[PDB]
Amino acid sequence: TCPSGCSGDCYPECKPGCCGQVNLN
């Protein structure tokens, strides 16, 4: 799965960035 606390929406890619931290700007 996606790291602990990852938004299921980031699933199934489970990108730590979406998973644990949203900040691409």
From TrEMBL:
Disulfide bonds join 2-14, 2-18, 6-14, 6-19, 10-18, 10-19. It comes from the Eukaryota. This is Nematocyst outer wall antigen. It comes from Hydra vulgaris. The lineage of its organism: Eukaryota, Metazoa, Cnidaria, Hydrozoa, Hydroidolina. The gene is NOWA. The chain holds residues 468 to 492 of 774 of the full protein.
